[PDB]
Amino acid sequence: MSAIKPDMKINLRMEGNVNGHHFVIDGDGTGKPFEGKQSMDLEVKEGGPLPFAFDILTTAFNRVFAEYPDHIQDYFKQSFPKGYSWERSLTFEDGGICIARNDITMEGDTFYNKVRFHGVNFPANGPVMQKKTLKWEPSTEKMYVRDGVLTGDITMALLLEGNAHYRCDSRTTYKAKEKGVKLPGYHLVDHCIEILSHDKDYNKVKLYEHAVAHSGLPD
Amino acid sequence: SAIKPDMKINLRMEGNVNGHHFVIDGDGTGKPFEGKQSMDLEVKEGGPLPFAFDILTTAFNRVFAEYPDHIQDYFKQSFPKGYSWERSLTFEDGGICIARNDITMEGDTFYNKVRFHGVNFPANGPVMQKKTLKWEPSTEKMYVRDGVLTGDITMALLLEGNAHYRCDSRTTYKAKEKGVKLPGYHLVDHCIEILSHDKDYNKVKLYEHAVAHSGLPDN
Amino acid sequence: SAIKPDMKINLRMEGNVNGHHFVIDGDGTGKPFEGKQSMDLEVKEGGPLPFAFDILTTAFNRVFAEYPDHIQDYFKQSFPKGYSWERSLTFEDGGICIARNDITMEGDTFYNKVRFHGVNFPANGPVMQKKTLKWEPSTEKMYVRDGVLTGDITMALLLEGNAHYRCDSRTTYKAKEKGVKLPGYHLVDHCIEILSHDKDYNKVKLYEHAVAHSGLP
Amino acid sequence: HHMSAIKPDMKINLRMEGNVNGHHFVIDGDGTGKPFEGKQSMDLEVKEGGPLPFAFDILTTAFNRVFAEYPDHIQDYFKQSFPKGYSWERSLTFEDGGICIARNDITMEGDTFYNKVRFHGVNFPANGPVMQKKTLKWEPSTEKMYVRDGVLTGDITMALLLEGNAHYRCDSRTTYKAKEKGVKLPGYHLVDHCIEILSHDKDYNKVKLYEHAVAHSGLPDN
Ligand SMILES: O=S([O-])[O-]
Ligand SMILES: O=S([O-])[O-]
Ligand SMILES: O=S([O-])[O-]
Ligand SMILES: O=S([O-])[O-]
């Protein structure tokens, strides 16, 4: 009924603008939806070398790639073959604010991702514009229904140079394309995201993510 | 200098709110030294808008603000070359927009290249249900933050049923030419009004009046 | 008629910021219809204060605001019985304060029982460092929310070296008597100033000027 | 770095004083816990200000991260802050504008932790879930722990389940400060927790509270 395969391809085009700098980024990769794992090779096609930390873009580069236990409704795998969309705001602690969206379709073995990313008000000598970010720290998304819609709320942190941290408050709304996909109960999604390799300027990046859904303590 | 007592305003806005793409053209006139401006707005692509027009109206130029002699006018000093702004709008129910405008002048006309993106407006909130009446009069705080002129404001939309709907906005302004003198802390009063519109807001007449001041007791 | 042209102000504040307990007494005067008040303040306990005195000053009465005829004056209408307010103050570096005042009146004097609690001010921040100079003049936005008069404001402290330090504040205002008529949306301009102080701010003279208006046009 | 004097089975003595929306209260607490298992229970009694006119649930995170199960590889700032103790300050920012701040000064004598807790809150809307007592429980959540401004900081966005099944968000920031010098600061880590009112009398004048807390490194090392 769902047509989600153990191994899937990922096609992606991201376009957007941060701090007035336009960019286009293409991604091709593979994932294991039932294992909650995915990888992607990315190439900056326009606007390279990027004047900002590549790390701010990486959560925009699909919750279908999360390991869901049987006892939790898997909204994302239940959304196919028709697919779904998400919208997200990223509010950073120094006033940098980004909005993003992805329209996700599926054709055969391949997920297609139309991603948009817009960012404003990053300070000139902040860690984003100065490329002082090292990685996203592992974090946990809270999944719950708000105004008829599945919503993911998370506070994430970028590890910085010198082992400082840089806070980002994120809210995502997820919407199945097909009418009447059953919404899940409150649950948690643990994730980690990692740049596996990159060239000096981050014109080429190999990206990986692992995500696991769960009910949290006590079980 | 470059600024004439009567100016023309040419504007194109392209954007996306809650997944809905749109294009809006603006043609108008204003008196920069009196801080007054009007515009006729025409929805080109994406009419009729599925969301409240009111969210867009602050994005449709601080050059049209009455500055007293004791306050540095950053905006009139930015011309002929012009300036750009970036803005975030954080609404109380989680809706978040980002906007930008690159402002140029040739002859007696200001040209505005405007982008507007918004996400996470609830289906039954006042924006998607078109339950807003107007922006209440407000006061923007201008000050320098990380080497850039920053405008901070809490605005409120009046709703049908008389409730108020809070928006927190931050704008950064940047002159194109190097070495334009940054002002000291000041305030800008403003009021914005949709003078007329057709049923579906595919046509809108918009007016704004803005006045800079020192605050109490010097205002 | 409860509001006289020249009134006195009695005040006791107690609180705790970043673990440090303090008591501060105030005695002042003002002109309710001119929207002007000043007060002499004295630290009775916990002096010298280890934090910037400025964080407390908006907690040291909107009855002292010049209201024009066309705006309902919730505050002067709340007397002789009084009103109370509650306020949260969210500073941009995570320092968060909450405050309360219960205001009563007898003759020509307002009595104020004030509480002020603050946490999470960083040691390297302007408050614990005492790098504040003044509150910049600001505009509070007054509207009804869930049946209660509410004031929302973005305020900013001028810092040494002319940086600013932002504070977001929400106040809820509550008349003691039933049937005090709620105003419509309006703005209140204010400026607050420490006029004089001794070295450690154990004694402080404070001044405020406030004016209600509709805004443009 | 040193021996904590923390025993496998500990007693907990607590007094909370506070004021929410102008309402003053005193609440006494007596419990027990297993520091190394990350588990604790407490019986709470309202001594002044009963019956409480707001949701008891807003207070329950205020009623000690000693009671967290720490792996060997993550520095345990809380157990290493003993025998001398530590204190925390916390802000609670609810989505409808209610704001609380809280403090706890934590000491130890023999097998007993002592807790001097202060809790103040303002601007809870009269018709909101807190003042209307429409909360059900805190959902399980994960706190992020890292060093900020030289201080161990816990940042968490938590949710109260409401009647009618909506959720009610609270953004909480805690700063933790050891009383003694020389307590090693931990690197970034996560703490999973669950908090539960096991039982209560009708007006919540008497409450039985339980919590389980587990620190980990997150994915993949969890
Ligand atoms: O996917 S994790 O390894 O960042
Ligand atoms: O711009 S004013 O007339 O609302
Ligand atoms: O009252 S003003 O001048 O600080
Ligand atoms: O403490 S747990 O059982 O919610």
PDB file of C-alpha atoms in Angstrom, chain A residues 16-23 50-53 56-57 97-99 117-122 128-129, chain B residues 86 98 100:
ATOM      1  CA  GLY A  16      17.330  30.079  -1.619  1.00  0.00           C
ATOM      2  CA  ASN A  17      18.886  33.164  -0.115  1.00  0.00           C
ATOM      3  CA  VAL A  18      20.697  33.916   3.136  1.00  0.00           C
ATOM      4  CA  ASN A  19      21.745  37.461   4.072  1.00  0.00           C
ATOM      5  CA  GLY A  20      21.083  38.493   0.454  1.00  0.00           C
ATOM      6  CA  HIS A  21      23.271  35.732  -1.046  1.00  0.00           C
ATOM      7  CA  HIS A  22      21.484  33.522  -3.614  1.00  0.00           C
ATOM      8  CA  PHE A  23      22.410  29.858  -3.993  1.00  0.00           C
ATOM      9  CA  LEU A  50      29.005  30.037   0.275  1.00  0.00           C
ATOM     10  CA  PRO A  51      29.696  33.101   2.522  1.00  0.00           C
ATOM     11  CA  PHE A  52      27.961  31.378   5.462  1.00  0.00           C
ATOM     12  CA  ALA A  53      28.228  28.214   7.592  1.00  0.00           C
ATOM     13  CA  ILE A  56      22.690  25.964   8.841  1.00  0.00           C
ATOM     14  CA  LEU A  57      21.332  24.216   5.685  1.00  0.00           C
ATOM     15  CA  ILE A  97      16.019  33.595  11.376  1.00  0.00           C
ATOM     16  CA  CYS A  98      15.528  31.131   8.528  1.00  0.00           C
ATOM     17  CA  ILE A  99      12.430  29.665   6.960  1.00  0.00           C
ATOM     18  CA  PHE A 117      15.674  28.095   2.153  1.00  0.00           C
ATOM     19  CA  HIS A 118      15.504  31.776   3.132  1.00  0.00           C
ATOM     20  CA  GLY A 119      17.584  33.397   5.896  1.00  0.00           C
ATOM     21  CA  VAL A 120      17.806  36.935   7.294  1.00  0.00           C
ATOM     22  CA  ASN A 121      19.525  39.064   9.911  1.00  0.00           C
ATOM     23  CA  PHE A 122      22.621  36.998  10.625  1.00  0.00           C
ATOM     24  CA  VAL A 128      27.207  31.712  10.898  1.00  0.00           C
ATOM     25  CA  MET A 129      28.694  34.532   8.809  1.00  0.00           C
TER      26      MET A 129
ATOM     27  CA  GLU B  86      16.116  42.351   5.618  1.00  0.00           C
ATOM     28  CA  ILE B  98      11.123  36.745   6.296  1.00  0.00           C
ATOM     29  CA  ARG B 100      13.831  41.712   2.029  1.00  0.00           C
TER      30      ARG B 100
END
